[PDB]
Write a protein that binds this ligand. Structure first.
Ligand SMILES: *[C@@H]1O[C@H](CO)[C@@H](O[C@@H]2O[C@H](CO)[C@@H](O[C@@H]3O[C@H](CO)[C@@H](O)[C@H](O)[C@H]3NC(C)=O)[C@H](O)[C@H]2NC(C)=O)[C@H](O)[C@H]1NC(C)=O
Ligand SMILES: *[C@@H]1O[C@H](CO)[C@@H](O[C@@H]2O[C@H](CO)[C@@H](O[C@@H]3O[C@H](CO)[C@@H](O)[C@H](O)[C@H]3NC(C)=O)[C@H](O)[C@H]2NC(C)=O)[C@H](O)[C@H]1NC(C)=O
Ligand SMILES: *[C@@H]1O[C@H](CO)[C@@H](O[C@@H]2O[C@H](CO)[C@@H](O[C@@H]3O[C@H](CO)[C@@H](O)[C@H](O)[C@@H]3O)[C@H](O)[C@H]2NC(C)=O)[C@H](O)[C@H]1NC(C)=O
Ligand SMILES: *[C@@H]1O[C@H](CO)[C@@H](O[C@@H]2O[C@H](CO)[C@@H](O)[C@H](O)[C@H]2NC(C)=O)[C@H](O)[C@H]1NC(C)=O
Ligand SMILES: *[C@@H]1O[C@H](CO)[C@@H](O)[C@H](O)[C@H]1NC(C)=O
Ligand SMILES: *[C@@H]1O[C@H](CO)[C@@H](O)[C@H](O)[C@H]1NC(C)=O
Ligand SMILES: *[C@@H]1O[C@H](CO)[C@@H](O)[C@H](O)[C@H]1NC(C)=O
Lengths: 430, 107, 121, 114, 431, 115, 430, 103
């Protein structure tokens, strides 16, 4: 005899929309409060197959972050009227030298009244200025021939806050609690939660900053370790302290380019001559690599390995790119990834017109920040590309790696309360 | 919430657009399951027996082999390809039950 | 490079404001914190000042500064109160921090002094 | 005699439930399908027919609109004819059905039985 | 005897609801929902269901969705406002004769990606879209700029007549008429129920209906009132009439940068073969087809020597046969067909670039030039006629809704009403 | 009588119970009305009834809760006051209603009432 | 002894929700019809607490009005190209003299073609224009350096129509029928309604125009009375007729300001007498104000009350204002509120650039209206503030205070049909 | 710093080290500055703040610790034949008349 049951504790793999739970853009958008007393239920004897490389929670996070970033930037000052020929010269220092990396550019900008144009000037980073002709002082902003450039609002903060992704009714999130789980295959110790832990969105290349730590030693995670066409994420069990700074105090000039359209640009720089740098303890970094190497060689035994600098491409992929107090740093990591198997200074560059997304349809302009900047952050992992000996390089990625490394423990499933089973008890009628 | 999901049946016991879509679907899923229980004549029940016999074609194992020794999750997989058959039979058995209840000269 | 112009000359009534301005040249008038030499027959001492560089202006050691950094007009301006007949000495204009970047804090004397001009109060 | 048709009631019932401008239109369509479904269930509920595709009541079946029936002739071959002949009184009949259930409740709220 | 209440009752009423579509293209992107690979149809017995194509709300819903998609698709594209400057125009000399008749060579000063710089650029434009500013002058402007927003169509998105099925939402059904001689209005005595319409190609034209369904009856003439000269007559044929429309030339496209990722496309040069455009319509097919239409008209208009005349006047949208031949908009002269009293015929044809498209003209679309030659092969499935002793007919027309009404004449939307009212049986199931 | 009618009725006389931005607001209003309806129905179903105006269940009163006789609390107090006087015991009653239905579900689990 | 569950119980809890608007912009938006015979239900022996100061319907009506205002203005002509230097002189009239309040401005604008410019003339009010210099005829429009100005489409009058706010399913609106109700606390005669009565969204400052009069004697309503920082709303039981006009006959032109778009400039003024004025009967005003004082003295007894005319603050605060025939009037009330306790003419001025509400973005340009304009309105209430006897000032307040005077009788409540009560009956058959 | 340098117009044919040392009340906030002229012209910076050299300096010397700002002028001869004076860029808008130590 058939018996119908309802409320049966079973589920299927599923893809749904999760909701985001908690001046600050993240706080403003993810207005939904978190559970102050979240529960986790251990499921006795449940084996569940996880695959962090096929996890749609990662794609969702990618899409929602871009959408928020665009929504935040959209209602701000457009820099279109500034796409004019610039007359650029050498950014002479108070020293009998030219400060490198900067240009002193002047231009004729239309103001609030359409009958007037004024000569204005500002200092710009060399990286964002493109030469129009050889043997010429005439330049243009780097993105004025490709796409719109919008100035980020000075009243909006992009500083990350922990974000919790929560399943909607009818869904649950399964979490893997096996400390040595490598990202794919069965997890033999699982639990059910409604929301993920709080993950701070972090935008970083090459090195993984401000994430969680591994337990049970360093874990080498890859879609396919043998296949050298894929990225290896190294998840560390101990952090490396990194201190980044911009040892100067900038002053800015405000140019009105329309009816309340205030454009900000560097007026002058007071301070050191090093534009930026990062301080990494030498012994900490050296111990970290020895431990990473010990683990890499268990996958590639009886071979020597080496760490080399990123092989090529633009600044976002060849340097360590990150947001430091609202400023954008592009640091040289060749001082770290140069070995074969007290502190280290990484020189850093600063850029103002940035993308940091695969989309180039719009660029963000970062207005100058007054005051000096110091950032202290935790390196929790590495992004490596493998290329006898093996070569590992601090390569880049699609920025999904910054979420794959935290969301590897979670899977979304649909709850299916109905089902049937046999018995030996016919329905009684009347 | 799920409790002993890892157990055999023998242990069984009890932006605006995206947000609107999520709410609407939660409602649609709820109602679809309730409608289906109503169709089978199991409205309001957690456990409901029926007039459909168990078929050996769905599973030829006995109760001591199906209950006690199979995980709910394993069971759903074992008979996943018969779910639509059993459900169709359940609807028809209720239709036949109504046919008799609604016969004339009876009330 | 900088070539500050001599201040507009004058032959002011006694105790008239010492109103004058120095055209800027070969420098960013948008930076270049400026000062007006407090000219005297023997030696200038102290100064009136204003700076585009800091969106600011300050009172003179004596009389008044009434100073401004007219970056827009490419000129320094001042109008000290009660010009003394004894104030009829030429005052040069100069500025500090005219550089794109400074290697030091703003604690140094200006060097790019104008030919100067007197106001014969 | 619409006898066979009684066995299709289930089939019809189960078919009731399963670009910003477009998104609004799609949400409205989904919401209305739900509202129509629930409006019918709520009405069957208030009449005391919840859970039934076919149910009976106690109403006067009044001569002011009800003519004499026939031995399975009147009980017409086509539902669309009843939709033109009986439906004319829907607005009074539905009211009678609610009142008959209200009377049943009055007869057995808490005065009798426990 | 007491009332029995039934739910799941096969009853319905006329209704208007939102219908949805079912299957780099614009339609494929919007009408993303798949079709039913095994569609069903339920045959109804003795249901004298009333249909009325003229008042059918499915036409209006289809029209509005077409307009909406057209605008939604065009909106995220390059604006041509920067080009609305005085044009300095001379003769286009692509030919050996130094004259290409239908086009002019126009020069203008336009702002480039550097907002402080303007450059002299030029392009060839059709005379139909260029407006003279004063008499005896070389000074011209783009047509309709001073009254409208002109937006360039983007090559990134494809537009082609992909057949779309319209499907009812749950709670609704579409009834279909299967009477071969139904003729527009009245009861259809052979009907059925479907969930989706057949696929209708969103083909847009002004005089001759192209790539549609063929009639089951030899010819069927449909109108609200054929004796009312204020209404349009739709004539559906059971045979396809083949017409081949050609643009026997090759345009060389140029590109003018106008902003930060913004560019204008225009014809820079024309290779050769001066005839601008023409259409080849079979002569014998047309003669037979038109005579057959008359035979049917004679049953409504039993008069000898009934005649046909060319469209009487108005702009190209109503005087010519308009169609999209493959990125180019043709405006062909059909006066060579509609001129009679009751191996091929070449219809002279012109090409236009700034297209109003719809009845709303506060905006317009600019069609970028198409490289290579065009040979569009299509069939006439029906004609649109209007009428003015012995009567005269002309290739006149409506508001372009006729184009979908001509397919949506078999379908109507009804709301399902599953709750019955009061059949009787039994007493009451007391206790 | 009316939609709320005699809302001010004594319990002893209780008798018996009886355009895009705009588009988003309207959809939200419709969705919430549906959710509220369904939550009441789900809540009653899990307490052992639906289709009833009045449900009797297997739950005793605390008698410390009201600390009063039935002859006064189901008499000289308006339904509106009744709600005000529950004194944050609502969630206790609801929990108890679920517990007793759960006990009934446990007693009906053997379900041997078959052919 | 035993628990009984009841459903359909006529009880409720205070609540906030979204009400819908039900029966130009007003009728276009509030397209939903109303009940021609609202079934008001009297609630026997029910006392409810009302609070007009904390009533969120005031806030909701306010926000919906703003949204509609902006939706209507948005798809219209921008006046961006008019930010040019204006060369202005003293405007004349059909009367060969000088209009003190008008300037005759010439300016250079973009015409139909982008490469052409034309010199145009227009008349503006002194209150629409600010000088760019000292003793020089060089001017700009007042809001050019702050925000975009959008011209209202001439097809929309925005004339107030009664608006009814209706509850969504599950909600009801309670109404207070106490003729002496003071705005807060218990109301001992209440009823329920489906929708509020129709309230016209009339905008004014110092004098509340139109709407219903008090059923009882003059009622003075205040959140505090004692606190001089609170708004005092005086609701009259008798109206005062006010007749306002612009006797001058205006004519307008139309200036193309680019493709499609055109500016409705003022052309000429003929028949010039006075820019504007308002007439209030003297006897009516004096008795009406005397009665208000009679009531103020019940809160402030044994004191001889005086008024301080026109208060202080900006034009929008000190001057009475309203929309009359589509034009915006700013009228001087100093002769109404300078007393100590056959008609009075109030001089009045007109503006073209309008900035209602606290946000100055999307400033509206009011096209001139040709011919002469007259309006007759009903003074239904006053807005007064306080500040040895008491001194009162006429004054403005938040725009929300205008609807507080109409919505004070209504409250939103959620209906809660489920409840539990004792029976001392146990469920039968286990 | 409202005090003068200890200058007495001391001068020499060579090495005219009239090191007045900018003794401006010993409170120059280490912003001592020097300038000189031998013409009816603005004085040119002789030295940059404290010990720092003036741009394009020659035949010159400087030191400072906000006090005792010795300035021996290297071994300057013709180069030293100018009047010269001290200032404190960062203190009291100070200036020292100092002396015409112009050989
Ligand atoms: C399978 O995964 C489980 C997580 O879902 C692991 O269970 C966790 O073990 C922790 C250590 O025993 C518990 O931490 C303690 O919790 C109590 C309160 O419950 C606190 O007072 C203690 O301070 C805290 N201990 C410390 C050091 O902070 C976790 O609470 C517990 N989690 C849950 C949900 O039960 C299983 O151990 C793991 N099994 C295997 C085989 O790995
Ligand atoms: C408490 O509030 C009640 C409303 O909620 C008030 O009831 C109203 O009293 C009015 C008489 O004072 C009635 O007027 C009648 O309206 C009908 C409309 O069609 C006319 O024909 C009648 O001629 C007219 N009556 C008279 C004497 O002219 C209202 O209809 C009635 N409202 C309702 C909904 O019943 C109570 O009066 C009020 N109590 C106190 C103490 O203020
Ligand atoms: C207070 O309410 C009164 C009505 O009771 C409002 O008066 C009305 O105002 C409108 C708009 O100004 C007038 O409409 C116009 O009438 C002229 C007549 O020639 C017509 O040409 C215009 O096209 C337009 O229709 C209306 O006539 C007038 N009503 C009366 C009786 O005079 C008054 O404006 C409201 N007060 C406030 C402050 O809102
Ligand atoms: C880490 O930062 C500190 C400053 O915060 C650097 O310290 C200076 O290093 C220079 C090197 O030439 C020394 O001359 C300074 O005396 C140091 N200052 C202090 C206060 O000690 C340090 O060098 C940075 N780390 C690295 C690797 O450069
Ligand atoms: C159009 O004019 C340009 C002017 O430089 C000329 O080069 C081009 O050949 C001309 N093309 C035609 C078809 O006349
Ligand atoms: C404004 O100035 C123009 C100048 O040509 C003149 O024709 C016009 O009459 C003047 N209008 C007024 C009202 O002064
Ligand atoms: C002042 O107050 C007295 C009552 O104390 C009143 O009679 C008198 O009329 C008041 N004065 C004025 C000017 O109204």
């Amino acid at each position: 005899w058939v018996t119908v049951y309802y409320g049966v504790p079973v589920w299927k793999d599923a893809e749904t929309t999760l909701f985001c739970a908690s001046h600050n853009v993240w706080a403003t958008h993810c207005c939904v409060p978190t559970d102050p007393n979240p529960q986790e239920i251990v499921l006795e004897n449940v084996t569940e197959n996880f695959n962090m490389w096929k996890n749609n929670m990662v794609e969702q996070m990618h899409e929602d972050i871009i959408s928020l970033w665009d929504q935040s930037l959209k209602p701000c000052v457009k820099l279109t009227p500034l796409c004019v020929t610039l007359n650029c010269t050498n950014a002479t220092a108070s020293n009998s030298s030219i400060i490198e990396g900067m240009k002193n550019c002047s231009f004729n900008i239309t103001t609030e009244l359409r009958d007037k144009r004024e000569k204005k000037n500002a200092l710009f980073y060399k990286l964002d200025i493109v030469q129009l002709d050889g043997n010429s002082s005439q330049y243009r902003l780097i993105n004025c021939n490709t796409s719109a450039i919008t100035q980020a609002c000075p009243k909006v903060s992009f500083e990350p806050i922990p974000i919790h992704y929560c399943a909607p009714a009818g869904f649950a999130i399964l979490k893997c609690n096996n400390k040595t789980f490598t990202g794919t295959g069965p997890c033999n110790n699982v639990s059910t939660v409604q929301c993920t832990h709080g993950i701070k969105p972090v935008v970083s290349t090459q090195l993984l900053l401000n994430g969680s730590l591994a337990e049970g030693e360093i874990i080498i995670r890859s879609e396919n370790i043998t296949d050298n066409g894929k990225t290896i994420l190294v998840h560390l069990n101990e952090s490396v302290k990194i201190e980044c700074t911009r040892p100067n105090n900038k002053t800015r000039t405000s140019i009105r380019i329309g009816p309340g359209q205030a454009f900000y640009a560097t007026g002058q720089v007071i301070g050191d001559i090093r534009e930026a740098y990062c301080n990494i303890s030498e012994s900490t970094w050296n111990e970290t690599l020895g431990k990473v190497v010990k683990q890499l060689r268990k996958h590639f035994p009886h071979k020597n390995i080496t760490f080399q600098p990123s092989s090529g491409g633009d600044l976002e992929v060849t340097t360590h790119s990150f947001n430091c107090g609202g400023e954008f740093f592009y640091c040289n990591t060749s001082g770290l990834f140069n070995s074969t198997w007290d502190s280290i200074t990484l020189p850093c560059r600063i850029k103002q017109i940035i993308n940091m997304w695969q989309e180039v349809g719009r660029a963000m302009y970062a207005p100058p920040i007054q005051g000096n900047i110091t950032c202290v952050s935790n390196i929790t992992g590495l992004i490596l590309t493998r290329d006898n000996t093996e070569t590992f390089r601090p390569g880049g990625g699609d920025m999904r790696d910054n979420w794959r490394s935290e969301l590897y423990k979670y899977k979304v499933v649909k709850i299916e309360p109905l089902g049937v089973a046999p018995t030996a008890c016919k329905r009684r009628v009347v | 919430f799920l409790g002993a999901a890892g157990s055999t049946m023998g242990a069984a016991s009890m932006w605006g657009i995206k947000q609107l879509q999520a709410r609407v679907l939660a409602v649609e899923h709820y109602l679809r399951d309730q409608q289906l229980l109503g169709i089978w004549g199991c409205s309001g029940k957690l456990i409901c027996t029926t007039n459909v016999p168990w078929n050996s074609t769905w599973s030829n194992k006995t109760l001591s082999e199906i209950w006690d020794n199979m995980t709910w999750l394993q069971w759903d997989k074992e008979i996943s390809n018969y779910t639509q058959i059993i459900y169709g039979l359940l609807e028809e058995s209720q239709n036949q039950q109504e046919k008799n209840e609604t016969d004339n000269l009876t009330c | 490079x900088x070539x500050x112009x001599x201040x507009x000359x004058x032959x002011x009534x006694x105790x008239x404001x010492x109103x004058x301005x120095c055209x800027x040249x070969x420098x960013x008038x948008x930076x270049x914190x400026x000062x007006w030499x407090x000219x005297x027959x023997x030696x200038x001492x102290x100064x009136x000042x204003x700076x585009x560089x800091x969106x600011x202006x300050x009172x003179x050691x004596x009389x008044x500064x009434x100073x401004x950094x007219x970056x827009x007009x490419x000129x320094x301006x001042x109008x000290x109160x009660x010009x003394x007949x004894x104030x009829x000495x030429x005052x040069x204009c100069x500025x500090x921090x005219x550089x794109x970047x400074x290697x030091x804090x703003x604690x140094x004397x200006x060097x790019x002094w104008x030919x100067x001009x007197x106001x014969x109060x």
